[PDB]
């Protein structure tokens, strides 16, 4: 079973932890990757009810299992905070325009 389902993509907690660790590492070191410069500060305009405090950052999580290293980021993102706490997993899939909806 999927711990997180983003549209048609299935993610286990381990996939999320791996992606989060990569994203947080870059944030701590002060570096970015990709033309869109990830990780991105995430403002949470959607108003998701995260149980952890902001600031938030979004980092791509890939359905292929690989860690994002540039190129097409897909539609899914892991959101973590300044303290390296998981806020949630979100996706553009099933959302209008460039908005996000939470993965189930």
Contacts to ligand 3GP by CB under 6 A: 36, 40, 42-46, 58, 73, 77, 98-100
Among residues 4, 15, 57, 80, which is the contact residue for Ca ion, using CB under 5 A? 15
**Least gap, CB of 1 to ligand 3GP (angstroms):** 26
DSSP letters of 46-91?
Answer: T----SS-S-EEEEEB-TTSPBP-SS---SEEEEEETTS-EEEEEE
Per this entry, what is the length of the chain? 104
76 binds Ca ion (CB under 5 A): no
Residue number of the CB closest to Ca ion reads 15
């Amino acid at each position: 079973a999927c711990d997180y389902t983003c549209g048609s993509n299935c993610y286990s907690s381990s996939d999320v932890s791996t992606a989060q660790a990569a994203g947080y590492k870059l944030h701590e070191d002060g570096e970015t990757v990709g033309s869109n410069s990830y990780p991105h500060k995430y403002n949470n305009y959607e108003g998701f009810d995260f149980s952890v405090s902001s600031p938030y950052y979004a980092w791509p999580i890939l359905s292929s299992g690989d860690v994002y290293s540039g190129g097409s980021p897909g539609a899914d993102r892991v959101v973590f905070n300044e303290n390296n706490q998981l806020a949630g997993v979100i996706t553009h899939t099933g959302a209008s325009g460039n908005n996000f909806v939470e993965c189930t």
